[PDB]
Amino acid sequence: APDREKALELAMAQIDKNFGKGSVMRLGEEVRQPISVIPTGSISLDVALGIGGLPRGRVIEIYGPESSGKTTVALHAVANAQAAGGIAAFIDAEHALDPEYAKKLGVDTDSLLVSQPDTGEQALEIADMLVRSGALDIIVIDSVAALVPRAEIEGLQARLMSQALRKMTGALNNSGTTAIFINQTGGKALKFYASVRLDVRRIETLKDGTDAVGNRTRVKVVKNKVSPPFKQAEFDILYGQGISREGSLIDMGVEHGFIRKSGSWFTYEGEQLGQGKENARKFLLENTDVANEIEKKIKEKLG
Template identity: 35%
Template sequence: MASAADIAKSLAAAIGANDEETTVSQFLPSGFPPLDHASNSSWDLGAFPVGRMIEIAGPPSSGKTALATAAMSGAQAMGGIAGFMDHERSFSVKLAPKLGLDTTPGLFTFKTPKTFEESLQICVVAANHVRQNKLIKKDAPICWVFDSLAAMVPRSAYYEMKDGKIKGVKSLEDRNMNDNTALARATSNAFPAFAQHCEDLGICAIFLNQIRQDLNVKFGDPRKTTGGNAPAFYFSQRLWLSASQIKKGTDIIGMEVTGKYMKNKIARPFQTASWRFMFQEDGTGKFDRQRSLVEFLETNGILTKGKPGFVIWDGKQIAKEALARQIESEGEKGFKSLMSLLPANYEPPVVVEADTEIDEDADIAA
């Protein structure tokens, strides 16, 4: 009988040596340490894995696009580039710089593809061109955002108007029940190869998605996302958001967002993080990471509670909102002072809860 070493040598001659294990070595930042920790058990690595496909799904105005923009700007800061496929026709290139994104052509690609297949092809062609021509450093990440999977039209279901008449693969009158599953069949066909392209080309592909209610589910979590079953297998992470309104008087000024990793092949799944997403006058949204981190530190007993709405800081009681604004005025130095309080060995509390539906109407005081 041959030894293991002899078998390995013989097999290497026939099929080559064993391949290296596929691992994630880079993450794009979310800007909020508890979300980074929920993603990969680290406060400062970042949240979004490079070389993988991920999903961010949630209700309207919960900050999905803002999270994706943070990832894109993070990729640029690391010497890479970003791209945005606007299938919903709602992204504002003019306002994006306020969230830290550099929209200079070359560093940022903006496209409005007509079909699902065209969108994926643009991403792969662009990334392959950049890598082959060494336009960025080898280890610089590429972040590509698709907004949203629910709005992506499969080629088989696409139609257009020309000279006042419907042109394309199929007219409205010819559509049937098979067209309702066209996107599911398209993702099933395309995602296996696309996942490999993401790994080979160093792409963090972020698919924004919508959460729907499955009326056939009588017990358990009735939520589902669009795109069929394939996304559940090929996304390395699925971050689902729920949100409650933050009100000041009768005005809705923001959302208290909770993100839960429904799937995570990087670290332990089902971890959560909560943060405040505040609406701005110009129509943008802003992560209030200072107030959100103060809330996290208080909830976990790292900051001592004072009277209602207050915590102990430098031996004195201070309102949580006042402390957050003080930290904000100190810039990154102030935020790092909060981060320094985060424990090196943090174990999230074990919470046993029943599956619940998204509550978009609950109110939280400002």
């Protein structure tokens, strides 16, 4: 009965010791909690991460198929980091960004540090020195696959990438700046350096009755060295409004009881919210007072 675990316990101990914390976990441990993390902007996912957001100082990767969310999540990461006083950097390699939309997500475009390098070898250095001023909070490279090296422009990528990754990884940990990498490629490197990888995919094209308000998405946390991995969260991203914070309260609201679905009628302890997800969504939208209370409750019922 005892001894085995005890040997295990000690085992699992020494591992983490020489290999860090997330070395050995259980798809059941409720462990850790850093006083630092960035709200995804969708609790659903925040919880997904276990820690309630992104592990600062860690290199995260959010890969997904063309037109899944990725950037959106990302720009959210950058917006929530922003509204906290620290400022964000955008390494542009895709030359495709819609500030407006960003602004709508919450991005302070005027104060967003961007840079459209010339070769893949160039961005990284930029990102690397720019990250060395530890003045940044969230730096985000856009398009791992759009990092063509000096050579080709005149197995390169993987290499090019590995190099900085090892280099930038060190510092990132020392400065407390968390990094984002969009992907589709450079594979290897990132695969391993990243301490958290999100796999994002668009499941349903949200039916608005009319023709479409957005799309319901799903992110699977294939790799999480800071909490139990393999989790996942689903949320909606309304065309031109980003992730509906309200849209999420409901889902968690119900998947955790704080709200009752009485047959296409949403109710919150006594009084009803609305009749229909969007209706109740509308409801909370204009009833933030109550809205945050749910978020609050949900955060209390879990952390």
